[PDB]
A paper describes a structure:
TGFBI-related corneal dystrophy (CD) is characterized by the accumulation of insoluble protein deposits in the corneal tissues, eventually leading to progressive corneal opacity. From our previous proteomics analysis and spatial high-resolution mass spectrometry imaging, we concluded that the TGFBIp is the main component of the amyloid aggregates found in patients’cornea and the TGFBIp-derived peptides are the predominant component of the TGFBIp fibril found in the amyloid deposits, respectively.
Biophysical study of different mutants of the 611-633 region of the TGFBIp has revealed that the G623R mutant showed the highest amyloid aggregation propensity and fibril stability. Since this 611-633 region with the G623R mutation of the TGFBIp showed the most microscopically homogeneous fibrils and well-resolved ssNMR spectra, we have chosen it as our primary model system for structural studies. We used a hybrid structure determination approach combining ssNMR and cryo-EM to produce the atomic resolution model of the fibril. Next, we obtained an electron density map of the fibrils with 4.9 Å resolution after 3D refinement. From the analysis of the G623R fibril model, the R623 residue is involved in the formation of intermolecular salt-bridge with D617 and E615 in the opposite strand. Furthermore, when we simultaneously swapped the residues participating in this salt bridge in the double mutant (R623D, D617R), uniform fibrils could again be produced, thus validating the presence of this salt bridge in the amyloid model. Additionally, this thermodynamically favorable interaction provided by the inter-strand salt bridge likely accelerates the fibril growth of the G623R peptide compared to wild-type and other mutants. We identified the structurally frustrated interactions within the G623R fibril using the online server, Frustratometer40.
Author numbering:
A (entry chain P), B (entry chain L), C (entry chain H), D (entry chain D), E (entry chain T), F (entry chain C), ...: 1 to 23
């Protein structure tokens, strides 16, 4: 909820999953 | 309320599912 | 409310799934 | 709902599904 | 969304599903 | 090299290999 | 080499290789 | 070199390979 | 080695490998 | 060469592999 | 400008039962 | 001007029961 | 002018039962 | 400008039962 | 703004049972 | 009695390479 | 007494590579 | 009495590589 | 009496590489 | 009585590489 003077920003959501099963 | 200095913005949602299953 | 400098933007949503098999 | 000068755009939604099987 | 002059545009949603056969 | 009176023994070797695939 | 009197023994070797396929 | 009085005995070797994958 | 009085005995070698994946 | 009275005995080698996935 | 590309559902279901007999 | 692209869907379900008998 | 991107989904459920008997 | 940003979700359930018997 | 921002969440459940009897 | 019963052998080798081109 | 029963053998080697280019 | 039973074996080796470029 | 029972063995080797770039 | 017990073993190797860059 940006409500102030103008500035620089960004919105980039990233998700990653990694796993190594040994059995 | 996404408002700020005129600039470039892109809602690029990156998703990836990786897993090294042995079976 | 995306209001800023008149620019071009396009969503680059990509999805990929990969696994392995061994029996 | 972005607005700008008459420009060109396109939804580059790509989807891929690949796995492996030994049978 | 684009609401400018009637320009050329069309969705290009590509899809591919293939599996490795072995039997 | 088992040697003795006649018996009704017999081998019952069976193999089972199941594998799932979701494509 | 199970040698003995002439009995009625016999081998019952059977193979079973089942695999699931989606296609 | 199994040599002795007669008796009942039969080999019942069985193998099972189970596996599951969630694509 | 088995060279004594008669006694019931038989091999029951069995293998079972279980594995799962949650992705 | 375990020689003695006819006592009950039978070899049975069992193996099991278990893993706890965490993602 | 209501536009939406088509879609197809690739529903699959596999099931079988096997019960031999020696007799 | 409602817009919403579709998504691929595929419900997988495997189940089987096997029971042997020597008689 | 509602907007809402979709999300890939897939229900996974596998189960099996086996009851071996030597008789 | 009502917009929804759902997250990725997928159900996972794997279980197996075995009850051997020599009879 | 009328925009939601849910948190990542996924159901996880892994359990198994094994039994054996010599009889 | 130097004799060995027959037995089927499972051996295969599959390979595939796909590459998209735009030009 | 050179005698040895056969056994099932499963040997495989799968490999695949996918690439993309926009030019 | 040169006798030696066989053993189950299944060698496998899977490998895959994926790359992407927008140019 | 040169006899020696074997043991279960299976060479496992899985590896993958990924290099994502937006350019 | 030349009988030497075996040695249980199981080769396991899991490794992966990832290099994400936005450029």
């Amino acid at each position: 909820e940006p409500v102030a003077e103008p500035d620089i920003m960004a919105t980039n959501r990233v998700v990653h999953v990694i796993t190594n099963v040994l059995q």
